[PDB]
Amino acid sequence: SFRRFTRESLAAIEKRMAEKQARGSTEEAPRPQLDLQASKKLPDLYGNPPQELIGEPLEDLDPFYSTQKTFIVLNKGKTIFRFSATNALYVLSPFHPIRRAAVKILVHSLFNMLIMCTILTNCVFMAQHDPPPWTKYVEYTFTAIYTFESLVKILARGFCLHAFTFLRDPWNWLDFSVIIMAYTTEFVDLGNVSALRTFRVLRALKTISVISGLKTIVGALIQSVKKLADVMVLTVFCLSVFALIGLQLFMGNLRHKCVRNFTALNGTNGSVEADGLVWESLDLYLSDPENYLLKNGTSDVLLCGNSSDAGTCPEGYRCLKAGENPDHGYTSFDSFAWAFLALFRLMTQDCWERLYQQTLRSAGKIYMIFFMLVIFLGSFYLVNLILAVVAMAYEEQNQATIAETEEKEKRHKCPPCWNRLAQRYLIWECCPLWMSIKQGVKLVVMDPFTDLTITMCIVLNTLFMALEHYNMTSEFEEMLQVGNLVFTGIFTAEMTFKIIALDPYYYFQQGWNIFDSIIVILSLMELGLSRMSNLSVLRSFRLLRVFKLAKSWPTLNTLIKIIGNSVGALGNLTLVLAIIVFIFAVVGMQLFGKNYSELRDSDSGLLPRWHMMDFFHAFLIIFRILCGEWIETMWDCMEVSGQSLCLLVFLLVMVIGNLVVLNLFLALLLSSFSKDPEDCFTEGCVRRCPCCAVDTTQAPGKVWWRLRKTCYHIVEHSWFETFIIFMILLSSGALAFEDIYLEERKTIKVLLEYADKMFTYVFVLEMLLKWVAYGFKKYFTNAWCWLDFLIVDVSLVSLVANTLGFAEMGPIKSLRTLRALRPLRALSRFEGMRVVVNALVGAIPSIMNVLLVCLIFWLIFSIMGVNLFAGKFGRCINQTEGDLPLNYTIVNNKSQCESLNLTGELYWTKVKVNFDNVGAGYLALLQVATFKGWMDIMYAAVDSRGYEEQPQWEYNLYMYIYFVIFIIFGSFFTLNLFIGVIIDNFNQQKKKLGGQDIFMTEEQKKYYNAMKKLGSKKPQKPIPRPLNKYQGFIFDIVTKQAFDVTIMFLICLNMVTMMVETDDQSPEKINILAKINLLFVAIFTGECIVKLAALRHYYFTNSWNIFDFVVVILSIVGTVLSDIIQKYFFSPTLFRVIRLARIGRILRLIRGAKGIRTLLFALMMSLPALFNIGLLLFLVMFIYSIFGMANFAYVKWEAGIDDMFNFQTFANSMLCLFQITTSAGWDGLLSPILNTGPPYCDPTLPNSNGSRGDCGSPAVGILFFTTYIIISFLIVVNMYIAIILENFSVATEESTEPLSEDDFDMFYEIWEKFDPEATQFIEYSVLSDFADALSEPLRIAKPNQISLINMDLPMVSGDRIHCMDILFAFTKRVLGESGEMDALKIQMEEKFMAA
Template structure:
């Protein structure tokens, strides 16, 4: 029994079972049992899972009793027994009685086990934990709560006692201390006892440990435990990525220290007038003057002093102030680069994109705008790469987990599979019958449908499982027939038929959809302030819609009977909506009823008629049900973090509130109570944590705040990212055309009938006015035929008989109504053909070049000439090609032009015999050659770049640069003439039709129009606004460069299919906007004190009327917040700021302070309005984001498959580069350096190429980085001296390395770019150290010398030198570089266009909020800086806030701007909103595709590794390793070294240890002395990697012949044996020895033993064990072989 791997029945665990286990343990101690090697645990029998169905029902007496373990792995190897409770849940215990563990048969242990496995015991613990968790989140508890807490503590202690008795203290993996959750439980209980009953209760940390009790919910739920184990596996996979992220963070932190150390202390200081002439030269670093805070310069409303720098592009001080290094760093000293710790925190902040715009401005003010490059690298590329890396690894882990789950479900026992198959067949049959019944319900042909359904015994049999099927009483049937199935008089039957015809008519569904849409429009019309007329109109309209919905419900009940009506879920939903709306009318005074219930239901009702909405909701529902444990774990973690933070920092926030604000007023974001702590954690998980961290460190110190915040950020984001990956993966299977419900089909039918009627009327009028020449034409004029033509392709209608046959098929629209014009409907249809309709024409999106086609006749024999009204001699003839050939087409364009020249000639227009025709033909030929010439294309491309670049020079200073302005005016005219000339040449060469059929040429034509309009605008002052459209000139770049064409085409193809999903997301946002209007309209107004710029307290001003009565020379302004919910449009903008987490804090503050309309807001009066924003972030942001990205990924994969698996964002030339880059996966393209023949040089060569030498150099680089880490600003002179000598030592060591390599490698040293880099580092470092010693002046700052030395740290990323995991993680980025570069070019173009537009419209906006001296639209560089911030979704709320200043009270429209003729500093809110919203959407779309490209590249690498072949570099590295094992070049290696040799090889020939079994299985020939030849090993390893087929055999023969040619002196030998035979001999000898030993032992036992034999059962077990032992011995031989 112990060795049987087959499943067995449920056998009680008895004394004999225990003796068997003890004997088995003794046997294992005496010898190594090989029969256990093949046993593995069954995933279906893990502890915590339910016992599978094939084991049958639980017999009486087996519940809560010890049973022999049904899993052979645990029973044999782990020596366990199991216990089942009534729910068939498996509990596993150790059977060995050691270390204070009672025997499994001990009555006390059996009683403890029964208590432990009982469901009520677990329920008691769960209720206790939940109660304790609720009590922990409460503050100011009454005294009697202490008794409850003591009771709960007693329950926990009792649970620990029961577990210790039942499981033992430490006796295997299933003991008490063998489970880590028990360690946590024991520790928490112990500390709670200490704090409760000892003098140590005053320690805050000991009290805080109690909050870990919340995590006890996890081990009480098996699903939560599984998710935790999965996340633990994710962390293992993420180890390399985390190490790489820490490496980059450390490097960038050191770089930040070298560049910005001490710079943030530079401030503008008012210098004393008497010392002005003496101290003006004393700038940064002045120690002669100790200023006070009042002497610093502060901007209006700023909390911290103005930063400045000594560079020309840094911030400048106003007149009377000088820039000195004084005071502390900004943000209470928490933002700086003065030491490694603060620099690391700043880099982590940039990586997580939390309030980065503030750090940008601080550094640019203090150091200069040139350092924006540093932030672009970190804040965009570094953050982008790491996010993609983490998402890629999580996606791989999730896919593997999903694959494992599928394998588990498919890997059940045959008995279990048969049971599951029977259940599936039963469910399928039930589903089929349910479908038939649903069809009966809506059938208009039978009135007794509902009665038939009720009497259907099969339905009643199928509705419930076997265990719960019960017959309904006859009286219940009679009651339903009487009360819910109405069969009355014939008049009622006629009414029933009439109602059925009404509700099933297609126009009824169309009418209802129109009503729902109008109802939503009426809801969206609500705004503040609203006139009484409009209010009454909306109220009447609401009553009308309620009446319509009520009539719909009544008609459906009459037509379907109540029983049939309530069998459909949507009807139940409609009835609930009607009841609630009627209740709303009755309870009109109850505020908020419509907001919380009715409005969302109306939006959901519209989704009934939209298949995309239903499909997405179905996917979302199934996904959330599958991920319920992950969602629950996330909620538990958020709750735990909030309680932990409240217990840890709550008292500090109360006691030290004055440290944050001078007036000691309470803060909005704190952790003094649970709600605020929960909101703080929620804000951290939303990505905004740095500001609350500053406040936390201000009140509680750095020691606890930083670890707590890092815990919440890291663990919380891991959970959110994993949830995001799973949801995106689910939505990536979305297909809008997968199904269409009956309501959607009715809408299609109604639209088709309406369209058919309109077409019939129009065609009748048209056909009556003119005579029809032929019968065929008459048939074509028939509306039914016309309708069918639009749904078919040319190939389907090429035959006239086939074409005319459609008239007969569609002559009666009533017979087949669903087939009418399905392809023309906006609602997707599953039967719609994917071919292109003739009526609608070829889509410009699918083919931006709008290629023309050549059609053949029906038989394909003769070609038809296509007549063209405006064809041309040189027009291209583009044959219809597939999407895989689109890019090839672009490169073959010239050939197509040339070949299509004669074919496209228009003989009807030009006579080839006439002289004028020949002249015109030659002119067109010449023009065609000109425009297709490569030099002409390069010239036009260069002119396009120059034309685009000149736009950047037209900033606010253009009027001051007169010469530049004149040159630009002449340049504009020259560019316009060049482009007009180019357009004329193409018109002549291609003709008008060919020119305007190409969308890229249309774009060029539009740009020419822009040129002309801008030139016209300069002629007259009243037309001057036309010059502002000059920014559109940059769009011409799209048509000139192939890379941007490819990216734009791919973006359109992956984005357009998401329109339906985007509309669903837009409806969700409209729902939240309408709810926001209902909740907050008119409530964001406040009375402002103009002297302080702050809001009056509510005890001084309570409403608008009191505010208007306060007169201090003028009335107090009753102002509205710039972002509000006064109408749906403002609501959308506010929601966008919430979605991008920019400015959302001020919006939430206004919401929670709101009191009522025309009421003064009060601090946190409406605190629970936080729930509105939490719900929106979850259901309005996170889930729609998953939907959109999932559908985009699906379209991306579809387009990628169409192009043969290649990247859709690269050109044909780049695909070749991509294939070349793939060699970097395994090969180092650098050729090996030849070893010198000189002994000394050879010794040095071996030294510098040894791995130990490389490790030493890497360690030196790390030590040198450590010396930079220990530095800080304003350190002591002794520290400065020590660091100088340490740097000198490192320079000398690196110089010695350089000399050694130069001596060993000779001239080959400079063939490696890495060596050249090291050489330059050494030269610069020596120069930086020696120059101050020789001339006494620093030409290179010491910090820069350190940074130059630090650049050597990139050797850690070098393939073959640094950690291999770093190399593997960098490969996706390298392979995706071509596509990322193309997408980046498009991003730059978009930024360029928007920057020019911003310069034209916002250059003179008043500087406040987000627009200042650094971030503005005055120059092109500043505009690009602003747009970079918006690209990362940061800071755009402040810029828009400044642009909102359009009133006299906020700006001055008559302000004179020096140096220009433009007046005013006001903005344009409408233009600003359109500007930022459009840019955010476009940039988000492009960046999402960037993420997808890199993640997909990361996911494709494992498949590439599996499918790759060996390259020349692989063989070269093989022989390089061989030389180490065969230094004498004998071509042989000893068989004992074969395992080490295989482990020393590089992938893919690499074979990790233990590998002896695999090597033996290769059956390698062996010569005398157990030696193996090099060629035999190479051929065997190659065959192992590449497989076995004819192609591989050919490659192997080529390898062998090549080896013979390269080694003509190969030693011939006759193999005497093979590795397989030698292993068989060794194993056979071992078996013989064991058999003989066993024989001798049996003989001794027979002679000595006189005891009686054991019982029959034990004999049977022994015989089985002996028999299975023989089988396992044979299996072990095969395994070893």
């Protein structure tokens, strides 16, 4: 505390504190007195800096918990540092000046500034893949600087000698090997071993030991992942169950292919002859790839099958199983490990479509249902559980921080001082001159007028630059020339014209003036290069003007807030993410550098894309693996690198990166968040229409009354709704038979023609009855009738058109597509549908408020893309060589390859998706944001060259940055904003109603809370014992945990048994393993029998016992089936369907492991919140399929359209919609409907129906796909929200926590002390002394006897006090009216009263 210490004062205390073992002592719970934990300022008592007393050891003026032999020092920033004043043997004592010099070296900030200048330097020189040798010398220097950093600490803190040593801190040795390796090579000669010295990357983790904010956020992440549990166990268990299921369905099923016909051996020792070619052996014909058939349009082996729904190849080929697995042989169902990888592939949702088609072709259509299950249980439920647990773990930290902060709180900037000379020179800008115009301008700035017009100037100009298309043929080039000048001048006119009105002493107030000044300086500086027309990209920074439309917007400021939060408030975590990405990008190169040298050997040395021979491609590949695409680049491993390393690298990258990104996303969100009926109508204008209120005392008025009552009776009857439902369902189903059957069958044609007419007749009759039953109240008190009217009018129009032979015109024939709206009339006839639509219609403003912002933000980047990439995507190609581009020595520009068109084999093509207009830019950006189909777009962009020039390989490798920026800005923050607004409005909507009852019907609302509880009364124990020899010990056998040990042992051994399975194996193991199966079934059956009469016949309860009989029956009937039908086995499908019954008997272990029960419970409580959403999704999908079958019937089979995936029939349309409902690839489906060119479109087509051509109309297709994508996303988001919230609803925890059972014992003992009289009346005059013996008094003692009279102690009869009026009074003193034990006790006391 003071300047210096004496030699004896320290001894005076270090001798006294050492006497604890002898005299000091013959509860502490050490805590930082003022949250002192080093590396923190924490001014506690002084609050001011000393004169010169800082920087020296102190005696720690606090409790003697940190005095001992240690001391505390502070730097110029009052940073606490604790050191130990101990020796290091030999001639070394703390009373030396060298230790003081070391403290001065260490505490001061200067030291930090040195070390950083090294670390970042060392982060550059290891970024090269071929360094010159003289870099060894720089390495030398680096080593020295780290020797220093170590030596001062080693001398100051001690190696491991006494306490607070160098190695006591866990971080200090994390770089200890740094000092080893750099010396190890110096004295020890090195061998000829590679794959070594990639350890240097560990060095850059020292950056964390420097910026303390990084250490705090690292600790927070570690705590979150240590609080995340009881999810991975469910994930691996469910994945293993699904893998076991799939190993029994698609085994060996991915090698089916059809080969050119096998003829015979021709009756000799052996000769396989075919078209004059001879083969020696069968394996030389079955394993020869020259006989394989290739799927035209791609590069792979066609798959096939013998099934009735599998498909066939052209004639001359026979289907069979032979060869190797497809796609480099890394996808398989032959063994458990490959099935496990395939399912983890499905879990993450990447490159599924292809696997889906490959499995579907060989298995057949009927197996699609399997995938339908695997997605739903896989992608949604587990991911929701992970998100919920992470969210809770993060909320806890903020809550604890706020609580601790509240508890703790409850306990000049003039360095130069020259600018003031300007303050006494400025301000008075009026001068002797002015005194008129100055106030004139100040008045002329009119907020209700000028502030509006300037706003229009910002708007109109932003639209004027949207007309920047391709080949104006001028007129627009000079018109934009004039406009961008007039607009810039008007915009910058007020720049300095506002100074006279607003004194420059107040020139800068809020910073919006700073932003406007920066924009003006931008424009002026840009308009400084007129001598040239080149460098037009320079003129693109004017799109910054669009941010001026921020001050008049209620949600753009919101966005600017989120942005600011992420950059600065959350910088401490984004820097960590950047460091992690850099570390992984560097380590990948060192791990797999020298492996792609031999990957060329073609086309004069071109290299395949996405390599790791350079830093930029490493960053790109890490970005892709962080964006959720990893199979495509993983499959480039296992070929050069091997199987043992790429797997681990990719898997840990996936975990680390996804966890960090999700935590940052949640952090950013939480930061940003903080009797006569009515005749016509009311008594208004009806005073001039005595048209219904007429005399009814005679015949003329009875008609209206009787007709209205009869119609009312008709509509209320339930059988009328039954009739309506049946007709509506039949109407919806009738439309499913409009496929190519129309020109193939005849009676179904006449049937449907009659049916449509009768349907329209009945519907119009409904409408006529409706317009009378309820008067005119409808259409104005219930809007649902508007949809009915808008639908029925369509059919009436078509009927009147076709009746008179006037429906041969295109507008009328095209009106037949509006019949696809027929199923929508059933939306209002079911309760769950009404609930979900009424809940969904409550967020349209929420949708629009994000739609506007996203639209503007995306237009900003669309304009840039148009200005950069326009007019560079064309090329010319040879017909017979496919669509591949040519070289750059024969053709250079479009005119040249059009002039070389002498043979007619040269054709000009343009990329389907381009940047030639704003609209196409919108479509391209939508494709890039969704992550499907962007590869070809970036292939076009990277390969770009000058205007109208043939592309060259990788001429501009830096175009990736623009797409990277757009993905990071248009996907992360947009999702943030959308989630924020939708959740906020949805919760406010729930808050308005008063309860949590949303998405539930009237019965479900009550059943959800009626069928959910969590309480127990008294379970017991039965065990018959009229025979002490057998069952008395059977009871001991069952009650012990040895029964649990037996069950787990047996089921785990069966698990291990059923983990030996492969393809066709030697018969010896086939039979022995069947012996093992028989033994396991027998021992399980024996265990279920030995259960016997332990509970007699009273064990048939809800406990987990009847499932023993269930599994015994199922397993025995699935196992003895082989003996039942031993005669023949000709059912290579149904037998396998029975054999899955072994999947069971493995779900018996969910009975245990209590923690894997509540999560499952929440799901069964949550399914009814998903049924209605599934129904709505089904209806939407059916409507879209019906609409889609009508326009794409004859689209050419190109790209994703094949024989098994088209729109010719209902089934194929449903399959395609199922494929695209999750946006799992739609570019390949949209692609073959944009073709219009004669090369790609045959106008004349000899079809067999009322249609011509095989190419669709894009103007319908783009809308059809975009609307489905957006609707599917909205519904999936709603399902996500419901599932997450249901998992938070199950957090009751100590909702009751009675613990009241124990107490009744003292009351019963007092009763026994009071029982023999059996009067049940007590007097307080004796209870005053009686209650003093209460064990741990929960009631009144003797001094409190006077108060007991006033606390529920009634006097009845002759001033008598009842005992039954005291039990609940005592009970509520600890707990009451909350727990189930209290309610049971009070009800038992009431029953005793009734007794």
